[PDB]
A paper describes a structure:
The zinc metalloprotease angiotensin I‐converting enzyme (ACE;EC 3.4.15.1) is well‐known for its crucial role in blood pressure regulation and fluid homeostasis via the renin–angiotensin–aldosterone system (RAAS), where it catalyzes the hydrolysis of angiotensin I (Ang I) to the vasopressor angiotensin II (Ang II; Ehlers & Riordan, 1989). Each sACE molecule is composed of two homologous domains (N‐ and C‐domains) separated by a short linker region and each domain harbors a catalytic site with a HEMGH zinc‐binding motif (Wei, 1991). sACE is related to the carboxypeptidase ACE2 which, in addition to its role in the RAAS (Turner & Nalivaeva, 2022), acts as the functional receptor for the severe acute respiratory syndrome (SARS) coronavirus (Li et al, 2003) and SARS coronavirus 2 (SARS‐CoV‐2; Hoffmann et al, 2020). Here, we report the first cryo‐EM structures of full‐length, glycosylated, soluble sACE (sACES1211).
Although the C‐domains were unresolved due to high flexibility, the N‐domains resolved to a high resolution and allowed for the identification of the dimerization interface. B, C The local refinement map of the interacting N‐domains was resolved to a higher resolution, and the model showed wide active site clefts, and contact between the interdomain linker and subdomain II regions at the interface. Apart from the glycan‐glycan bridge, the interface is further formed between residues of subdomain II of each N‐domain, specifically the helix of 456–471, Cloop‐2, and Cloop‐3. Equivalent interactions occur for both domains due to C2 symmetry. Residue Y465 is at the centre of the interface and forms hydrogen bonds to K469 and D462, and sandwich pi‐stacking with Y465. Y597 on Cloop‐3 interacts with F461 via T‐shaped pi‐stacking and hydrogen bonds with the N460 backbone carbonyl. However, the interface had an area of 1,054.76 Å2 and scored a favorable solvation free energy gain (ΔiG) of −7.29 kcal/mol upon formation of the complex (excluding the contribution of satisfied hydrogen bonds and salt bridges across the interface). Dimerization does not appear to cause large‐scale changes in the apo N‐domain conformation, since the monomer and dimer cryo‐EM N‐domain structures compare very well (0.65 Å RMSD). While the monomeric N‐domain showed zinc coordinated by H361 and H365, both dimer N‐domain active sites showed a rotamer flip of H361 away from the zinc, with metal coordination only via the H365 sidechain.
Author numbering: 1 to 608
Write the structure that this text describes.
């Protein structure tokens, strides 16, 4: 520990704690920058040297969070709740959280080693065909691509069976040990369990109830969608393997976790005679290039009179693919270095209509970072953890439209045909609405484990209960408590909350509606754009400047006017497809929901 990074002495006063907050701030951006710089380099190009620098940076960060966290508890754990500023209470409350650093070394060294071991066995999971094969598969590319692409039911089944079997089972013992150790650490931090810690972020005493009220508002839309898809699969696979009343076999939905079904959009799409618009042909013809695209993205924000990207951003960012042959993580990401001056993007840009949209949300994050850089570092995070991605997405929504592309000049004429825009809303529904029930059930399920209400003998039972209850899916081959299908997801062994994403996808439209309402727009909400609309920016800026200083429920209210989440705006956005599906279901006599829930298909005749 460098002494300039090691805390000093502070009194039990607020007057002291204000000085503690100030000292933590000044040290914090000096450590976090050094940490993120290393992590930036390692990700900007892989080298074992940079991986080492990445590893050392990780340790240096934790060592810093520890050295300060321990004193924050020692001096202010008896007090912090008392302090007059809600901003300061947030500052100290964050520092005062220690997480795993509560565990004594013996447990601590098991804990880290245990968490790493889960990620290893998941990331390095494998499935092998039932021969003396030279070669096995892995989740990507082999499994993701066969599962999405092929539709011979047996082959599709085996791929799903192998994965949840191989990925889950060897996790089963580890995940229990994680659960015990996880809760024990937070107990000392001040939470009943890890689950009550995660819910602490949303600072809402009624949080879990709020979700069910939201989800109940979605269920008519989701059931409408689910019931529609279910019929389509019946056309494809046969009466033996689908029940037009029952739930859907989990592996037919084109995705290993059935969390988003878009790979059956090719099978289901409405109005097969219409195209789906691709503006790439203009963009290449215009001589658009990656470097230019961001200037369009910046144009948008400048058009809202949000802040332009500072010169440092253009000096630093890796907008283009590198000139070297060096290996790089191409997946696009946006970075804030807590050093106030320089913000950074990595995009690996390929000039296509899709990545044009993608750049806009990635720059959206940068605009978000730019606005709250003025806060003390402890607060420089989204108003709540799903709130940051929402401000990212509302931007991509607007520009994805044909309407905005015409103001970009990339589109020649607007073509207001509902058959086309239904195609667009429906694919987006198969992407994101299918995700809401899944995103909801996981963190209910994990809260069930962390609260203990799902003891280890029920890990798998409570999972499939939650799947059929919410997502309308059931397992394709009988699954029993030797298995552990909850582990087969990325976010579970990586102990990463999904609930942020669900909160975000609701805040997304709850903003978009409140912006389009403010931008003077009227008409079909998916045809709104806010570009050039200074009225939207000045209100949006008020959200971004707040960062996390001000409780999100108060900030959301200042933007939208509602003290809480609501899915009515989301239903407004999807309204056109909502109507269309209701017609199509009513025409087919399709039974919304899934009675005969106690059904799942027989096995293929010679399996395998
Ligand atoms: C990615 O795309 C970027 C943008 O490309 C341009 O725009 C897009 C939409 C497409 O249409 C592209 O085809 C198009 O090229 C590229 O940056 C641009 O690169 C080109 C070529 O390298 C640049 O063109 C050259 O610019 C010189 C400077 O011209 C400006 O400055 C003069 C003073 O030096 C001034 O007198 C001019 O009026 C001009 O001012 C610009 O005005 C327009 C509006 O009228 C603004 O939009 C600009 O921002 C203004 N820029 C400034 C600095 O004020 C010219 O001297 C030069 O002409 C000479 O060279 C050409 C060959 O290049 C000869 O053919 C010609 O006869 C003459 O001798 C030429 O115009 C362009 O300026 C760059 N953009 C900017 C903003 O500077 C990226 O390089 C590209 N990257 C990749 C990898 O593709
Ligand atoms: C969390 O902790 C950070 C870091 O300690 C605090 O930032 C510092 O806050 C103070 C108060 O706002 C700020 O002082 C003001 O800075 C303005 C710019 O001052 C710069 O120029 C003068 C000369 O004109 C220098 O004397 C200063 O040291 C500054 O120097 C420049 O700083 C930038 C930014 O880091 C750096 O990139 C440049 O390299 C450097 N210049 C050169 C030539 O190298 C003044 O206009 C103003 O009047 C005040 O002096 C101080 O500069 C901040 N430092 C940094 C590193 O950010 C945060 O305030 C704190 N958080 C909160 C919420 O308070
Ligand atoms: C990924 O990005 C990083 C940052 O841009 C980039 O880092 C550089 O990589 C090169 C090798 O490709 C490093 O060069 C050597 O590093 C070794 C130690 O690992 C040194 O022994 C070498 O010393 C000589 O060179 C020095 C100047 O670099 C001289 O001052 C010295 O006297 C010796 O003559 C040499 O430094 C370089 O150090 C790193 N730098 C950093 C900051 O990482 C890396 O190249 C990129 N990846 C790829 C594949 O290009
Ligand atoms: C932060 O506050 C602490 C506690 O008020 C200060 O700690 C004290 O620091 C002095 C030196 O400034 C230490 O002196 C040592 O005392 C022992 C005898 O106990 C002697 O054998 C050593 O040779 C040395 O003189 C003292 O131990 C230490 N005491 C405590 C309780 O921490 C500290 O000075 C303050 N920080 C700063 C930067 O001033
Ligand atoms: C994380 O997983 C790894 C791998 O399962 C665990 O490391 C393994 O630990 C065992 C002993 O605990 C090692 O087996 C022993 O090896 C020695 C020879 O080194 C042998 O004499 C013993 O009879 C026994 O076979 C095993 O080699 C070791 N593997 C690796 C790769 O290190 C680790 O303990 C797990 N940690 C947690 C927290 O789960
Ligand atoms: C939960 O369901 C699984 C199947 O999905 C059951 O596990 C299976 O049980 C049978 C009977 O023991 C195993 O067959 C045996 O395999 C061994 C080779 O491993 C072979 O030598 C025997 O002759 C016999 O064929 C089968 O392999 C096994 N599968 C797995 C993946 O373990 C399990 O019994 C069910 N849970 C409970 C509590 O019964
Ligand atoms: C910190 O907590 C204490 C205890 O809840 C508060 O002290 C009490 O304050 C009320 C009025 O605010 C008095 O009627 C009590 O007599 C006080 N009790 C004691 C033991 O002093 C204190 O006000 C809180 N501080 C803040 C800033 O809210
Ligand atoms: C598209 O045409 C319909 C015609 O009824 C109209 O109601 C709708 O508002 C048009 N789109 C926009 C963005 O105005
Ligand atoms: Zn994002």
């Amino acid at each position: 520990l460098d002494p300039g990074l090691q805390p000093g002495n502070f009194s039990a006063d607020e007057a002291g704690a204000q000085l503690f907050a100030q000292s933590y701030n000044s040290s914090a951006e000096q450590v976090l920058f050094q940490s993120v710089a290393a992590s930036w380099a390692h990700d900007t190009n892989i080298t074992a040297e940079n991986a080492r620098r990445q590893e050392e940076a990780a340790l240096l960060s934790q060592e810093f969070a520890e050295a300060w966290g321990q004193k924050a508890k020692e001096l202010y754990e008896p007090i912090w709740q008392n302090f007059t500023d809600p901003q300061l209470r947030r500052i100290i409350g964050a520092v005062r959280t220690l997480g795993s650093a509560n565990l004594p070394l013996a447990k601590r060294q098991q804990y880290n080693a245990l968490l790493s071991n889960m990620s290893r066995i998941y990331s390095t999971a494998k499935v092998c065909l039932p021969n003396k094969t030279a070669t096995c598969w892995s989740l990507d590319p082999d499994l993701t691509n066969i599962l999405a692409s092929s539709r011979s039911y047996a082959m599709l089944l085996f791929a799903w069976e192998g994965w949840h079997n191989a990925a889950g089972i060897p996790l089963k013992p580890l995940y229990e040990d994680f659960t015990a150790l996880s809760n024990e650490a937070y107990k000392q931090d001040g939470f009943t369990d890890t689950g009550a810690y995660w819910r602490s972020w949303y600072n809402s005493p009624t949080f879990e109830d709020d979700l069910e009220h939201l989800y109940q508002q979605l269920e008519p839309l989701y059931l409408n969608l689910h019931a529609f898809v279910r019929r389509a699969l019946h056309r494809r696979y046969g009466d033996r393997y689908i029940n037009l009343r029952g739930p859907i076999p989990a592996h037919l939905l084109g995705d290993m976790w059935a969390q988003s079904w878009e790979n059956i959009y090719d099978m289901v799409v409405p109005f097969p005679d219409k195209p789906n618009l691709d503006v790439t042909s203009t963009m290449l013809q215009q001589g658009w290039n990656a470097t230019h695209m961001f200037r369009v993205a910046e144009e948008f924000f400048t058009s809202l009179e949000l802040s332009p990207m500072p010169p440092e951003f253009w000096e630093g960012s890796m907008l283009e693919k590198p000139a070297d042959g060096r290996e790089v993580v191409c997946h696009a990401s946006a970075w804030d270095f807590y050093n106030r001056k320089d913000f950074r993007i990595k995009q690996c840009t390929r000039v296509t209509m899709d990545q044009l949209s993608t750049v806009h949300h990635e720059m959206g994050h940068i605009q978000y970072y730019l606005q709250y850089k003025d806060l003390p570092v402890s607060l420089r995070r989204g108003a709540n953890p799903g709130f940051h991605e929402a401000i990212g997405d509302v931007l991509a929504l607007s520009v994805s439209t044909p309407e905005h592309l015409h103001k970009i000049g990339l589109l020649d004429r607007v073509t207001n045909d509902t058959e086309s825009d239904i195609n667009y809303l429906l694919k987006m529904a198969l992407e994101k609405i299918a995700f809401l029930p899944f995103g909801y059930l996981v963190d209910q399920w994990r809260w069930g484990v962390f609260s203990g209400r799902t003891p280890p003998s029920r890990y798998n039972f409570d999972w499939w209960y939650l799947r059929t209850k919410y997502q309308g899916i059931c397992p394709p081959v009988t699954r029993n408590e030797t298995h552990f299908d909850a582990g087969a997801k990325f976010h579970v062994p990586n102990v990463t909350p999904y609930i942020r994403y669900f909160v975000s996808f609701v805040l997304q439209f709850q903003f978009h509606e409140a912006l389009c309402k403010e931008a003077g727009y009227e008409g079909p909400l998916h045809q709104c754009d806010i570009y050039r609309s200074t009225k939207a920016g000045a209100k949006l800026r008020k959200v971004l400047q707040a960062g996390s200083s001000r409780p999100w429920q108060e900030v959301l209210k200042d933007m939208v006017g509602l003290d809480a989440l609501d899915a009515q705006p989301l239903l407004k956005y999807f309204q056109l497809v909502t109507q269309w599906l209701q017609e199509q279901n009513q025409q087919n006599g399709e039974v919304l929901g899934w009675p005969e829930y106690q059904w799942h298909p027989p096995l293929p005749d010679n399996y395998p």
